[PDB]
Amino acid sequence: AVIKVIGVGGGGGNAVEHMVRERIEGVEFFAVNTDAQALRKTAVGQTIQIGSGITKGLGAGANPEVGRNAADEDRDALRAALEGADMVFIAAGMGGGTGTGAAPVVAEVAKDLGILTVAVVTKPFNFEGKKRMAFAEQGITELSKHVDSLITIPNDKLLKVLGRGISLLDAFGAANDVLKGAVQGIAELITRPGLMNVDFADVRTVMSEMGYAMMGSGVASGEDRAEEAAEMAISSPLLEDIDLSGARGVLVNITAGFDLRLDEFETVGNTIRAFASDNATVVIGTSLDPDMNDELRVTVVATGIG
Amino acid sequence: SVPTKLEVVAATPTSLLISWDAPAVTVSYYRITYGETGGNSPVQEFTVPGSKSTATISGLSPGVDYTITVYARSAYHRRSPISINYRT
Ligand SMILES: Nc1nc2c(ncn2[C@@H]2O[C@H](COP(=O)(O)OP(=O)(O)O)[C@@H](O)[C@H]2O)c(=O)[nH]1
């Protein structure tokens, strides 16, 4: 399956800059912005400038309306770039102008081409103030009309795992890392499959036209790695706001080396199937990281959460 | 790049004390590997809690060059490990 990752606005561009730097195997990177100078500044894959007629390349002025109008003016360039994809991840920091307003247009264009359309977006930190949070929530509502799955990562949740005395700059770096881990934790089922390989049609089944989603991850080493990593994922602060038995779909990626035991795959799946509703679509597969020894990662995406 | 700095802080003929910077986000545990640079032996491995910023590697041999590698295993990132060389 052909996977494209598109950063929208400045935050989404910084996130994609990080994924390009740290690398996600098997995906193709793009960046969409109204700010032409920001587009050119760093390596973010191919660049797509939107709204040059109305913004003159000078940005959206933190105004979601301008981001929307900019993307509306350039649906043709968006469609031309998206064509050929089986799946697209749209990454954006919501609460500014371009991400908030242009991301739902990018998503609408992609949905129209029949692409499986997954948004991965952040809500701002509390310290960024009430108006940015309001803009973010309105843009997420607009976005939810035009995606297959919309994964929200609230930056306020990341606050509680940040080291003390952290710099303001490293706090945003951490947001990039979580977004990168989020895309990577879904994409690697496709691009680095292990033994229990997920068919892209089953990815589509658990993600297509599901609406809101959240994800959590766990990691563990040693004899109890499977139980420990699964429970850590389900206890994740990024998942704590939802009842997992309420999700209409659950996608699980177990990342392992070549030493996965049957009883470990059994354990992870039994734990998921216990907390998931009896009528949920449940897809569990494995991915391969050969540089692991006696350890495991479990990534859980709860989809269709309402 | 996590940890972002890794150094040998003290060295004896059969042991090395390594130190790294505190991480920006919670690390669940660190995986530490080490072995002779270009060796027919598999590297040896151990883990330390994610609250540590040092570890001691023992059972080494004098005058051997070693490659040491630290993986920070976090639920919140997939950052690459950091690696150094050091001769006892
Ligand atoms: N992941 C990430 N998020 C950011 C970064 N900078 C800002 N953000 C978040 O993204 C939101 C939107 O800001 P920005 O993307 O710069 O505005 P836009 O270009 O008008 O879409 C901000 O309110 C922050 O919460 C960054 O470097 N990385």
Numbering used by the authors:
A (entry chain A): 11 to 316
B (entry chain B): 2 to 89
From the paper:
FtsZ is a tubulin homolog GTPase protein that is widely conserved in bacteria and plays a key role in a complex called divisome, which carries out cell division. FtsZ polymerizes into protofilaments to form the Z-ring that acts as a scaffold for accessory proteins during cell division. FtsZ treadmilling, a motion in which the protofilament polymerizes in one end (plus-end) and depolymerizes in the other end (minus-end), drives cell wall synthesis that constricts the Z-ring to form a septum of the cell. In order to aid high-resolution structure determination of the FtsZ protofilament, we developed a monobody (Mb) that binds to both KpFtsZ and EcFtsZ with high affinity.
